[PDB]
Design a protein around this nucleic acid. Sequence first.
DNA 1: ATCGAGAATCCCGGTGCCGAGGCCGCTCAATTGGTCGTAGACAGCTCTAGCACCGCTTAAACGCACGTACGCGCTGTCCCCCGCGTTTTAACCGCCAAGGGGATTACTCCCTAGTCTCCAGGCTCGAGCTCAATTGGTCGTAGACAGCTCTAGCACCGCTTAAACGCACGTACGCGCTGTCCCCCGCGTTTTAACCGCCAAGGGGATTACTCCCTAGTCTCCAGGCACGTGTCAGATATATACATCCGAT
DNA 2: ATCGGATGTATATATCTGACACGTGCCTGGAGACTAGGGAGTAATCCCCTTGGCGGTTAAAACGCGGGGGACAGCGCGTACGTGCGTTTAAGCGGTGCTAGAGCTGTCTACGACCAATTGAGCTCGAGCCTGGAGACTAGGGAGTAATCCCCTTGGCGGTTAAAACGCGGGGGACAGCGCGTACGTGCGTTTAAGCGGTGCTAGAGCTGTCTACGACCAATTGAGCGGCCTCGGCACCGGGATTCTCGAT
Lengths: 74, 69, 79, 77, 79, 102, 103, 102, 92, 90, 92, 95, 96, 97
Amino acid sequence: LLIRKLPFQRLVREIAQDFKTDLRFQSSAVMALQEACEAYLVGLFEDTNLCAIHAKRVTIMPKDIQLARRIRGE
Amino acid sequence: NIQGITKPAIRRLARRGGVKRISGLIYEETRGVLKVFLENVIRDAVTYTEHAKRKTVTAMDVVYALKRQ
Amino acid sequence: RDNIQGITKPAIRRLARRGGVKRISGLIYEETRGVLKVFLENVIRDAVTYTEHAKRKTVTAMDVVYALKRQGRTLYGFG
Amino acid sequence: NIQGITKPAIRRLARRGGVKRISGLIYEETRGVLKVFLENVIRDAVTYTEHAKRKTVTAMDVVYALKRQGRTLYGFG
Amino acid sequence: RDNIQGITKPAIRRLARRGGVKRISGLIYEETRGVLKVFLENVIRDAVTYTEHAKRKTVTAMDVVYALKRQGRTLYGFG
Amino acid sequence: TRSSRAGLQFPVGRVHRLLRKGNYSERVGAGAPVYLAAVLEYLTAEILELAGNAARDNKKTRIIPRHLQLAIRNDEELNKLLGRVTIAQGGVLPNIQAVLLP
Amino acid sequence: KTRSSRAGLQFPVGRVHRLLRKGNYSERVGAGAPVYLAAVLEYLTAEILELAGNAARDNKKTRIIPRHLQLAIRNDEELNKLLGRVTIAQGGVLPNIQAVLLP
Amino acid sequence: TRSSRAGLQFPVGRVHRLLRKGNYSERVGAGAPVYLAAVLEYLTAEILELAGNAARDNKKTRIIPRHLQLAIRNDEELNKLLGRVTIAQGGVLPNIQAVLLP
Amino acid sequence: SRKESYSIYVYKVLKQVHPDTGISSKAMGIMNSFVNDIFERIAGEASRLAHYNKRSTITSREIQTAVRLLLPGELAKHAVSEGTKAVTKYTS
Amino acid sequence: KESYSIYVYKVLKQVHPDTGISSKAMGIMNSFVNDIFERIAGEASRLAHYNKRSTITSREIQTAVRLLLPGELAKHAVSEGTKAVTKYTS
Amino acid sequence: SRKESYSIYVYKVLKQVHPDTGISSKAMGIMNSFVNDIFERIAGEASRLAHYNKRSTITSREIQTAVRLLLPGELAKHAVSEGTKAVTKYTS
Amino acid sequence: HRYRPGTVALREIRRYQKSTELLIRKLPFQRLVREIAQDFKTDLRFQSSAVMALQEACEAYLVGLFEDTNLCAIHAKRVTIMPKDIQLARRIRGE
Amino acid sequence: HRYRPGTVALREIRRYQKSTELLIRKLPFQRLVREIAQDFKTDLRFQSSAVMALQEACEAYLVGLFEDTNLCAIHAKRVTIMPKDIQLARRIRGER
Amino acid sequence: PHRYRPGTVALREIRRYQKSTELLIRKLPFQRLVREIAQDFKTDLRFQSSAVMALQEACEAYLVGLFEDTNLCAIHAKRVTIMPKDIQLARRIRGER
DNA sequence: ATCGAGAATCCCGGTGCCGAGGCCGCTCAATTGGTCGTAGACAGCTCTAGCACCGCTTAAACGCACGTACGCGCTGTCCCCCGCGTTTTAACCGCCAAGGGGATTACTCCCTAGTCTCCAGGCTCGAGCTCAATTGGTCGTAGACAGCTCTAGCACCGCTTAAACGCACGTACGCGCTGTCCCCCGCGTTTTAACCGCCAAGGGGATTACTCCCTAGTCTCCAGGCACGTGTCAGATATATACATCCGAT
DNA sequence: ATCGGATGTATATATCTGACACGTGCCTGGAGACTAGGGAGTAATCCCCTTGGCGGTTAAAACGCGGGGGACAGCGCGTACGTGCGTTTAAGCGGTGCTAGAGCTGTCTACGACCAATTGAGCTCGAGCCTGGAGACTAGGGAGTAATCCCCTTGGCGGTTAAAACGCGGGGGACAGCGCGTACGTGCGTTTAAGCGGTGCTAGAGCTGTCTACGACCAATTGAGCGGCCTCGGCACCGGGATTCTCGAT
């Protein structure tokens, strides 16, 4: 995993609070969320990279991400 | 807490994604994207948790959310 | 035979126009045909499968609807 | 006497075995197979009979032969 | 962990060669692993049972020999 | 009727039967088909409301598929709900990328 | 008072004990061994009779026959495993036709 | 010794003891361990004879497991007797299906 | 030859929201497709919910949770409001 | 000439009070009980021998059951044997 | 630490059949496995024979019948010949 | 009226898999058993139940063998069993 | 008179985004569907509405694909769509 | 350059490995396999060396025989390539499945 | 960047109409419903792992400046490819007959879910008997301790064979196709195996007088299982011919 | 097919190392006598009963005959899958050396199987009832098949607007040049994360049990939609307005 454990966990608990009060988390639940998030971001960066290269660049930019996410239907 | 997902971490994720060069504006953008994805999954996960009348989000709650997405 | 050529250049142009396209490379048309054929093949294959499972010789609208649904392209209006 | 195990009998056995279509050459083949099987079992059965110093093969003689050939039979004890 | 993968493709090929096999489908290797694992599990289970009955913490050659014998796969050479 | 008891227009009895015969569960609670019927009715009402609006904007008194498509795609949440759905004879929203204009 | 009664069993503890003593299995037999064995045999008998009784009832018969025993055993994965190399006389086989043979 | 009295190489006394302590029967006849020892000796002799033959065919003076395997599998009756037996380090008989050859 | 559909109920709803508005046959077909589709989604999710929780009964609770999973935001809130109101009125 | 017939019948009456059994079926049940007896007793005998013990105890029976019976059958059989020995001992 | 085996007897037989031939330790282990295996088979079958016939004694007769049951064909005939000869010589 | 090839075969499969009666005739089987037995031991008699035991065992064996044989035929994309199917089945069984 | 390159194209975009009629000819599409279906099972028949369903699905699919393709072209600072635009759009969609 | 036709080297390998008796699976990885599996039955078990070697001999003999039967099934279907269905048929007829 | 003509396209107002939209009704056919009660199934009940939260550590990882070159943006050109004028055609398509397929009409044939008659097959008190509860001192097996060694395990460090990973292809199997031959199906006949039935005795199961042969306990002796030092056949290693076999060629 | 050639395998080979089987000797435990005894096993000696035997009936199973379709088996043609190949890396193997459970053997003591009557009731068989189930049986359903009917197709005949095609010319793509600017390696301060410990404790998890939930089932009923009738309104069409890009100019 490429993101640090503790800040990710902190983020997850923060986001979760705005949906439901008094929540706890199984350890493997947080690990599940991290595996899923990282996998998503890596895949998105693959598509983003394809968009950058399409525009004859080697540098990824926000517009590359936005094109990738629009075509994905996000 | 979103700023805890640091620049070098995002860089590592991008390298696994095959990216060689990265604009400075990517990091914030990535954070926004990450947040949206997390909020969506977690919103569903907790829904499952609440249906089961539990206060603890389980790995299965997350798995079901991910599956249904 | 060779009915994919019935998907004409002006038809593909019209589809592209509805898609918001202003200018079109000459190589697009053949490319489009290949893409369309693949899509059609995939849908019809599944549709026919349903038809065959039902022991029918007539492909129904529902066969197509089911094929599309299971290919994540739900179609409204033909139930 | 092996020819007394007729074609329709072998067909019935095959049907119980789930067979739908049967080559003409099966029947003779089956007979050979049957004979071998019978021979082996009976050879052992009689051995038991002889050990008991009897002239009559019993159901138990057969059961023991079958058991020792890894073909345990229930119902004849 | 995951040590069944130590049963490599070339090892399985060698075993198949000794078995007289000239050509091998790509799906064979994984299949073989599953089969081998089941076999091993069954033998080792019984072996360990004997070990446990003897109140030992060391699986002996005889434990394995007995397991194999009672599974109809008598092994010579390790008494 | 249960629909009248629930204050609904959509058929509670029929929905109950469809739940029973759709092999969703071995047992079905008394409130389940009522709830489901109510939800289906509401969503129908939202789409018909917006589609009617579009029809009148177009000075038409009859709703056609085009109006359903306009209603759905111009509404963020309906567009989300029906994101992978094709409306037959719906067409698309008028939209030209700015860079393409003179 | 019998040992089977004390053990809560129907199967004969005394007889099982004697059969163990005289079966040339070991020089000695513990007091609990025939109880345990009798209990196991009774359990397995009960499981088979339970299923066979069911099959008999489906066939609207009040008496269990070999056919019902075969049906009960072969349709149960673990019993079928236990009795994998056993022939039930007059048991027949499970109805089973390979799909490729069907029209 | 009883082995000498029986004209044997295998140990009659030891076989008798093993019969007594193997819980095979309450009583053991005087001839039983002699007969058993004689049979064990004979079978040992047949396997060793064939294995020795294989060893010499391979120009080896020492019998190894390979020779035992060759001896057993190339002999129909020994192969039958030891049909469900694994000879460690025995390998297999050379055999290629004819259809596989060029 | 008897074929059931949601047409008359869709039409009753239409008359509730837009009293002087009609609807074409094609459009009605799209509405019927819609109702059947959403029926399937909700019922299926509810089935899964009951299964996950080792319940043999689909209740209004499973329906509600399914609605919350399947519908976006305010649409979900509004739908939940309608269903709840309907169930409580029915119970009385 | 001994058999398990009366005990099989008592068990049958326990699980299916209104069900009977044919002569052939009873013969098969007797064959069954004798078969499983032999399997378990034999394995127990070998267990005792391997470990240089002269006594077959309930522990040998239990281990033999674990070796011979598959899965759930093994677990339930072990449970019944243990329960029976516990009820018997007091 | 005293461990008995059939090694020396196997070796004596080996010297009888192949005077100038030796044997590896592994091969000797396989031979020992063989003798123990056949011992078990024959003794076990004889035990069963005596039991079936309500005899408390295993005699050379039980051994012989067991040999006939367990061994194939000519192997059985030859083994029976060896055992019989040995028992009659012993008796004298 | 003539059923198509296969229909009656399938009917017979269902029929005989449904039932349990012995499928070989009593008297020829008995005759065979006595003949085979004579080449092992002279002057033999047979208990009735001994011959019935042998028949139950033989028929069970043949039915099982035909099951495996059928599997071999189907493996070769046939529906017809042939001697080579039996021979493959028996080789793999270790017979 | 002559309109400049692009003016009539834009006009056509407005026209066809305003309407909903199918843009492929009915009978040739039908022939396409029947040819393809016949290469899976011979002698098949079709309900009329089945072919119409297939056409609606196909045209909706192509129009959406052309939207994404157009976005890819614009991304590369072009106004002309090219095969590589289609291929990128479909690669990101997960079709390729 | 030089290149043997598909099958020639395979046949050569068959002759080679049917001539010899050495174990064909690597020792240490097999040992790890045995210990992992055994540990999922009872923790902290030890092994006699010869116990692991016994297990390897048994396993390889089993797999080689299985490949013989599998090969026969492949040839029966007029193929020269063994496939999972061949293994499954062989094991079904053996009574393993 | 900003009118202006005008002709072009498109829009806007009016016309008539024709088939879709609206409306009932027929009835049948798609709804509830009262009572059942077992039931999952949800509510009260404990223990806990594991979970929350804490209380250190430093160090992998986190942030901050430097140049800086890679990466991108901005213009001019080229062309050439595509967009928009005229001109010709051919499948589209309206659109109006015909036929084979298939489904569903009925439309026929043997199998199928139940319906009773008559048992052979199991239930029942009475009368034995033999195999199973009840102890007592017994070895004596074994269970529990306990020391002592062994060896299974860990674990560090080479290196090198082997295991993985592309790639060019080249068979090798998977499917299509056809002739055919050869085995299912039934039907007309015939055996001949049941079916039933009677007798003879051969053998077998039980019975007893007895006996020898196999256990038990003893003595001693040695054969033999364990170390221990030794040639020697097994292995290693370069070294050597003789196949063994794949590109050119009959 | 066969013959060369051409490398590439395989194979005896003679030499040297070596470790490992072996022959020597050495104590001990297990065999061999060895006697005495008692019980497993014989060998007549019966009842009797089960099994061969036959013997006549016959009814269905088996056999032979003939007919067809359909399974088998070439046979071929494709594509793609696994192979043979080289290259790279990674982990197995050997080495070496410490270890710490744990086998292992021995020790001491004590539960506790056992034999031995001993009673005795559970078992078992008998002779005499009392039934599910087997068969003989019916009433309906199976589907197998056409059969005509309708539909979908095929075709045919137009005419025709779009499509195909061209002509032409203008404008983006892209490229290169250059400006130009920002992540980023990099180096070092940093700082808190994961590991490592730890204790108390909250709801999750397993659990118990009554209850209220809902299939459920004709008993009862009421509305709905296919069919059909009737109606207008937007759609095609015809003519004026608007606006409107595009040349006519800066």
